[PDB]
Design a protein around this motif. Structure first.
Motif, PDB file in Angstrom:
ATOM      1  N   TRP A  95     -55.571  -3.292  27.431  1.00 35.26           N
ATOM      2  CA  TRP A  95     -54.149  -3.464  27.723  1.00 35.26           C
ATOM      3  C   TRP A  95     -53.304  -2.977  26.559  1.00 35.26           C
ATOM      4  N   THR A  96     -53.855  -2.961  25.350  1.00 32.08           N
ATOM      5  CA  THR A  96     -53.068  -2.553  24.190  1.00 32.08           C
ATOM      6  C   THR A  96     -52.620  -1.093  24.289  1.00 32.08           C
ATOM      7  N   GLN A  97     -53.387  -0.291  25.022  1.00 32.08           N
ATOM      8  CA  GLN A  97     -53.056   1.112  25.280  1.00 32.08           C
ATOM      9  C   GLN A  97     -51.647   1.278  25.796  1.00 32.08           C
ATOM     10  N   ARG A  98     -51.235   0.324  26.621  1.00 27.92           N
ATOM     11  CA  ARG A  98     -49.894   0.269  27.170  1.00 27.92           C
ATOM     12  C   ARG A  98     -48.808   0.646  26.168  1.00 27.92           C
ATOM     13  N   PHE A  99     -49.001   0.263  24.917  1.00 28.42           N
ATOM     14  CA  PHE A  99     -48.005   0.517  23.895  1.00 28.42           C
ATOM     15  C   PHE A  99     -48.126   1.919  23.313  1.00 28.42           C
ATOM     16  N   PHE A 100     -49.191   2.618  23.698  1.00 27.32           N
ATOM     17  CA  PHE A 100     -49.553   3.874  23.049  1.00 27.32           C
ATOM     18  C   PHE A 100     -49.698   5.049  24.001  1.00 27.32           C
ATOM     19  N   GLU A 101     -49.181   4.883  25.215  1.00 27.27           N
ATOM     20  CA  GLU A 101     -49.250   5.916  26.247  1.00 27.27           C
ATOM     21  C   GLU A 101     -48.771   7.284  25.763  1.00 27.27           C
ATOM     22  N   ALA A 128     -54.005   8.918  12.866  1.00 27.41           N
ATOM     23  CA  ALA A 128     -52.757   9.024  12.123  1.00 27.41           C
ATOM     24  C   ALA A 128     -52.086   7.670  12.007  1.00 27.41           C
ATOM     25  N   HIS A 129     -51.853   7.038  13.148  1.00 24.98           N
ATOM     26  CA  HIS A 129     -51.166   5.755  13.169  1.00 24.98           C
ATOM     27  C   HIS A 129     -51.997   4.661  12.503  1.00 24.98           C
ATOM     28  N   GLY A 130     -53.314   4.731  12.689  1.00 23.27           N
ATOM     29  CA  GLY A 130     -54.235   3.810  12.050  1.00 23.27           C
ATOM     30  C   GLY A 130     -54.080   3.799  10.541  1.00 23.27           C
ATOM     31  N   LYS A 131     -53.859   4.984   9.978  1.00 24.95           N
ATOM     32  CA  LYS A 131     -53.553   5.141   8.567  1.00 24.95           C
ATOM     33  C   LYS A 131     -52.387   4.229   8.176  1.00 24.95           C
ATOM     34  N   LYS A 132     -51.299   4.308   8.937  1.00 28.70           N
ATOM     35  CA  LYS A 132     -50.114   3.479   8.703  1.00 28.70           C
ATOM     36  C   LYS A 132     -50.388   1.971   8.809  1.00 28.70           C
ATOM     37  N   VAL A 133     -51.209   1.585   9.778  1.00 31.19           N
ATOM     38  CA  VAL A 133     -51.516   0.175   9.928  1.00 31.19           C
ATOM     39  C   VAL A 133     -52.290  -0.295   8.705  1.00 31.19           C
ATOM     40  N   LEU A 162     -39.377  -5.096  14.375  1.00 32.30           N
ATOM     41  CA  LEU A 162     -39.755  -3.950  15.194  1.00 32.30           C
ATOM     42  C   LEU A 162     -40.709  -4.353  16.329  1.00 32.30           C
ATOM     43  N   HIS A 163     -41.827  -4.963  15.957  1.00 32.85           N
ATOM     44  CA  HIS A 163     -42.818  -5.421  16.926  1.00 32.85           C
ATOM     45  C   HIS A 163     -42.258  -6.462  17.901  1.00 32.85           C
ATOM     46  N   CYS A 164     -41.408  -7.352  17.387  1.00 31.01           N
ATOM     47  CA  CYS A 164     -40.792  -8.413  18.184  1.00 31.01           C
ATOM     48  C   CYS A 164     -39.702  -7.899  19.121  1.00 31.01           C
ATOM     49  N   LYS A 174     -38.265  -4.649  19.551  1.00 21.72           N
ATOM     50  CA  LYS A 174     -38.263  -3.326  20.169  1.00 21.72           C
ATOM     51  C   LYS A 174     -39.534  -3.025  20.960  1.00 21.72           C
ATOM     52  N   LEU A 175     -40.683  -3.378  20.396  1.00 24.57           N
ATOM     53  CA  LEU A 175     -41.956  -3.054  21.027  1.00 24.57           C
ATOM     54  C   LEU A 175     -42.359  -4.060  22.099  1.00 24.57           C
ATOM     55  N   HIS A 176     -42.047  -5.330  21.854  1.00 26.38           N
ATOM     56  CA  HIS A 176     -42.415  -6.426  22.756  1.00 26.38           C
ATOM     57  C   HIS A 176     -43.931  -6.564  22.890  1.00 26.38           C
ATOM     58  N   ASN A 218     -51.887 -10.261  19.937  1.00 27.55           N
ATOM     59  CA  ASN A 218     -52.499  -8.985  19.672  1.00 27.55           C
ATOM     60  C   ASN A 218     -52.691  -8.712  18.178  1.00 27.55           C
ATOM     61  N   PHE A 219     -51.855  -9.332  17.342  1.00 28.71           N
ATOM     62  CA  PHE A 219     -51.959  -9.150  15.881  1.00 28.71           C
ATOM     63  C   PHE A 219     -53.244  -9.770  15.379  1.00 28.71           C
ATOM     64  N   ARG A 220     -53.560 -10.932  15.929  1.00 32.66           N
ATOM     65  CA  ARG A 220     -54.804 -11.586  15.626  1.00 32.66           C
ATOM     66  C   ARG A 220     -55.991 -10.751  16.110  1.00 32.66           C
ATOM     67  N   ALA A 265     -47.315 -13.692   9.427  1.00 35.88           N
ATOM     68  CA  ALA A 265     -46.156 -13.087   8.782  1.00 35.88           C
ATOM     69  C   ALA A 265     -45.536 -12.079   9.729  1.00 35.88           C
ATOM     70  N   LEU A 266     -46.401 -11.292  10.354  1.00 33.03           N
ATOM     71  CA  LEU A 266     -45.956 -10.278  11.277  1.00 33.03           C
ATOM     72  C   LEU A 266     -45.366 -10.922  12.533  1.00 33.03           C
ATOM     73  N   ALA A 267     -45.795 -12.138  12.823  1.00 32.16           N
ATOM     74  CA  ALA A 267     -45.278 -12.820  13.994  1.00 32.16           C
ATOM     75  C   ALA A 267     -44.065 -13.693  13.691  1.00 32.16           C
TER      76      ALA A 267
HETATM   77  C1  HEM Z   1     -51.892  -6.546  13.484  1.00 31.35           C
HETATM   78  C2  HEM Z   1     -51.205  -6.011  12.478  1.00 31.35           C
HETATM   79  C3  HEM Z   1     -50.252  -4.816  12.688  1.00 31.35           C
HETATM   80  C4  HEM Z   1     -49.678  -4.186  11.667  1.00 31.35           C
HETATM   81  C5  HEM Z   1     -49.890  -4.542  10.176  1.00 31.35           C
HETATM   82  C6  HEM Z   1     -48.849  -3.120  12.195  1.00 31.35           C
HETATM   83  C7  HEM Z   1     -48.097  -2.235  11.460  1.00 31.35           C
HETATM   84  C8  HEM Z   1     -47.386  -1.180  11.981  1.00 31.35           C
HETATM   85  C9  HEM Z   1     -46.817  -0.091  11.224  1.00 31.35           C
HETATM   86  C10 HEM Z   1     -46.918   0.081   9.689  1.00 31.35           C
HETATM   87  C11 HEM Z   1     -46.197   0.732  12.077  1.00 31.35           C
HETATM   88  C12 HEM Z   1     -45.452   2.026  11.681  1.00 31.35           C
HETATM   89  C13 HEM Z   1     -44.007   1.992  12.161  1.00 31.35           C
HETATM   90  C14 HEM Z   1     -43.229   3.088  11.461  1.00 31.35           C
HETATM   91  O1  HEM Z   1     -43.440   3.270  10.236  1.00 31.35           O
HETATM   92  O2  HEM Z   1     -42.399   3.770  12.120  1.00 31.35           O
HETATM   93  C15 HEM Z   1     -46.352   0.185  13.411  1.00 31.35           C
HETATM   94  C16 HEM Z   1     -45.863   0.724  14.574  1.00 31.35           C
HETATM   95  C17 HEM Z   1     -46.267   0.460  15.854  1.00 31.35           C
HETATM   96  N1  HEM Z   1     -47.002  -0.643  16.274  1.00 31.35           N
HETATM   97 FE1  HEM Z   1     -48.055  -1.888  14.907  1.00 31.35          FE
HETATM   98  N2  HEM Z   1     -48.952  -3.146  13.574  1.00 31.35           N
HETATM   99  C18 HEM Z   1     -49.808  -4.183  13.927  1.00 31.35           C
HETATM  100  C19 HEM Z   1     -50.151  -4.522  15.229  1.00 31.35           C
HETATM  101  C20 HEM Z   1     -49.800  -3.890  16.416  1.00 31.35           C
HETATM  102  C21 HEM Z   1     -50.359  -4.144  17.744  1.00 31.35           C
HETATM  103  C22 HEM Z   1     -51.462  -5.201  18.038  1.00 31.35           C
HETATM  104  C23 HEM Z   1     -49.741  -3.312  18.616  1.00 31.35           C
HETATM  105  C24 HEM Z   1     -49.944  -3.145  20.149  1.00 31.35           C
HETATM  106  C25 HEM Z   1     -50.897  -3.748  20.864  1.00 31.35           C
HETATM  107  C26 HEM Z   1     -48.785  -2.510  17.863  1.00 31.35           C
HETATM  108  C27 HEM Z   1     -47.947  -1.536  18.373  1.00 31.35           C
HETATM  109  C28 HEM Z   1     -47.245  -0.591  17.646  1.00 31.35           C
HETATM  110  C29 HEM Z   1     -46.630   0.613  18.190  1.00 31.35           C
HETATM  111  C30 HEM Z   1     -46.627   1.112  19.656  1.00 31.35           C
HETATM  112  C31 HEM Z   1     -45.987   1.314  16.984  1.00 31.35           C
HETATM  113  C32 HEM Z   1     -45.195   2.637  16.969  1.00 31.35           C
HETATM  114  C33 HEM Z   1     -43.902   2.451  17.759  1.00 31.35           C
HETATM  115  C34 HEM Z   1     -42.793   3.288  17.159  1.00 31.35           C
HETATM  116  O3  HEM Z   1     -43.065   4.065  16.205  1.00 31.35           O
HETATM  117  O4  HEM Z   1     -41.627   3.172  17.629  1.00 31.35           O
HETATM  118  N3  HEM Z   1     -48.853  -2.892  16.539  1.00 31.35           N
HETATM  119  N4  HEM Z   1     -47.080  -0.976  13.306  1.00 31.35           N
END
Ligand code: HEM
Ligand code: HEM
Ligand code: HEM
Ligand code: HEM
Lengths: 139, 146, 139, 146
Positions: free
Chosen positions: B37-43, B62-67, B91-93, B95-97, B102-104, B140-142
């Protein structure tokens, strides 16, 4: 349900678990005890520290029930029936704990089977463990 | 969140050993694979139809790098995760919803990834300290959900 | 599993739901939307505000699937099969959301059926809704 | 946790109407009935073999009173739940070993109880404000776990 690919993944991953079956379930428990200390209340009579034969033997009992589930993966509720009653009725194990233990199992599997813990197998083992948990909290 | 010196030790050490260029991709990847289901955010990332496809996807790596950077970040401020992630919270709260559960899930997929790649080194006490961390990041993220 | 007493409780409680079936499922959704705003992303095209026919009609579709489950409570996976694929494959509804919706349903039932929402029926409706959720996230 | 004036309004008003002498018993009771593993913590309360028995149990009604007070308390300090529940945190965390997910379950059983007893009055926005509260109490109560 478990897909056939789920079934073949699990039978495979558990297939290479081998005689380590007991060792692994013991290490899963330790990992759970250390990582989530609340879970220790269900074992306030076991020795829970490292090197404990108490953990190790139960670790074995648990891993053998898993292996039993792997074999009867299509009829797991009938297979795990007696353990369902055990955990839910008498022991009253909070369903949260199944998730905690399941995660520690994956961690333990990931750490002993570098080659077998692919994403797809990971996803299978997760669906599998979630299934076992569901049967065990069914009553 | 309070880690002990030894827990800080356990964590900071093994973390140094982390290939900060692929681990994040591998964690994000398994999240998309293990919890579909998490794919939903990454279509917008395109081809995510098999695990092979998902893992071999550059936008995911790429995005994994950022995480992974964000975790590495929060690792600096174990004392203050709440403030570090304040940005990422909104942002996550708002805009992304994305549901915070999912953070856990991401945190635990990360722990599995570490386990896989470090095997024996990833001892049960080492895993414990890391559970403290990913839990802390998640909460913290939540916080802009609270 | 669902106990027979579970089954009779649910058939009973839902038995007195009546034609309000649609009304209730709509109110459950509103309650969910207000209480857990993240859940609104699955309906970014519905009107979600109060008085919405969009919510109400879907509220009806949902409550009719429930009523369908109540009738085939022993073969719910076969009954809810097509909705399983809908929610898990195409819609990709996060399983957390089922718990949130289930709770709002109970709240909605508790608020419209003062006499029927006893502890025992409450426990039955919970086990029931948890069951529906399990089928819906099965694929 | 930040409630709005109207949410504070919605909450404080209906709360005044609460029979603070039975609602807690009814909530604790349904927790023990709906989520039977919770009984584990209450084996010292005796007869808990049917719901009728559980609900008609004086130790449950008694203890329920205390739980309800704690919510009523935290209601005073919506601004500071974390500090109010600091005591109750350590106890539940260090001595009782109750998984914090159970705090959320109690909070929702409470919401159901309110719904049941107030029917129509317990509107969806009213329920919303209350979800903010019980979530907040749970997290505050779960802080010595963090
Ligand atoms: C669990 C710890 C998490 C951390 C530390 C984290 C961190 C981040 C970071 C650093 C970005 C980069 C945003 C930017 O620089 O523009 C991001 C974006 C994003 N996150 Fe996460 N994230 C987490 C979990 C999740 C989860 C579980 C989901 C979805 C199931 C998610 C969905 C997204 C999406 C779709 C973006 C990009 C959206 C956009 O750029 O507008 N994140 N997050
Ligand atoms: C993968 C899920 C599980 C499996 C397959 C499993 C399996 C088993 C088995 C086969 C036994 C019987 C041992 C014996 O008779 O010697 C047992 C007992 C027990 N299990 Fe589990 N279990 C699981 C999950 C859990 C969890 C999550 C907890 C607590 C956090 C737990 C706590 C216990 C306890 C306290 C006993 C009593 C053992 C004794 O009295 O010696 N189990 N389990
Ligand atoms: C009790 C659990 C549920 C039941 C019985 C249920 C039932 C249904 C049914 C029968 C439909 C088809 C409606 C139609 O074809 O007009 C549907 C569609 C849908 N459901 Fe569910 N559902 C449940 C849970 C959820 C949850 C928790 C969410 C999201 C938080 C959700 C989101 C949706 C969405 C977005 C649609 C698409 C409706 C449309 O496109 O018009 N459902 N559901
Ligand atoms: C959810 C919000 C909760 C609140 C606000 C709360 C509050 C309280 C309060 C005020 C007491 C009285 C302690 C004293 O004055 O001596 C107490 C004790 C206790 N709590 Fe809770 N509680 C909550 C949840 C739970 C849950 C979910 C469980 C178990 C599933 C639990 C288990 C216990 C037990 C067994 C005691 C008595 C133990 C003793 O006296 O040593 N609590 N709690």
């Amino acid at each position: 349900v478990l897909s056939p690919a789920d079934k073949t993944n699990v039978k495979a991953a558990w297939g290479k678990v081998g005689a380590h079956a007991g060792e692994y379930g013991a290490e899963a428990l330790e990992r759970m005890f250390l990582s989530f200390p609340t879970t220790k209340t269900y074992f306030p009579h076991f020795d829970l520290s490292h090197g404990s034969a108490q953990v190790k033997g139960h670790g074995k009992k648990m891993a053998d029930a898993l292996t039993n589930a792997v074999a009867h993966v299509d009829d797991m509720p009938n297979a795990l029936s007696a353990l369902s009653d055990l955990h839910a009725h008498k022991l009253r194990v909070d369903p949260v704990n199944f998730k905690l233990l399941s995660h520690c199992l994956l961690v333990t599997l990931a750490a002993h089977l570098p080659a077998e813990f692919t994403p797809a197998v990971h996803a299978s083992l997760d669906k599998f463990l979630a299934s076992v948990s569901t049967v065990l909290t069914s009553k | 969140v309070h880690l002990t010196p030894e827990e800080k030790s356990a964590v900071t050490a093994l973390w140094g050993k982390v290939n900060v260029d692929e681990v994040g991709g591998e964690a994000l990847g398994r999240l998309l694979v293990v919890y579909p289901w998490t794919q939903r955010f990454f279509e917008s990332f395109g081809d995510l139809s098999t695990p092979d496809a998902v893992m071999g996807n550059p936008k995911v790596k790429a995005h994994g790098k950022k995480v992974l950077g964000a975790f590495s970040d929060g690792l600096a401020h174990l004392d203050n995760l709440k403030g570090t992630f304040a940005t990422l919270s909104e942002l996550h709260c708002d805009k992304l919803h994305v549901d915070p559960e999912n953070f856990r899930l991401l945190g635990n997929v990360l722990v599995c990834v570490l386990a896989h790649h470090f095997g024996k080194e990833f001892t049960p006490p080492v895993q414990a300290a890391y559970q403290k961390v990913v839990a802390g990041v998640a909460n913290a993220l939540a916080h802009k959900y609270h």
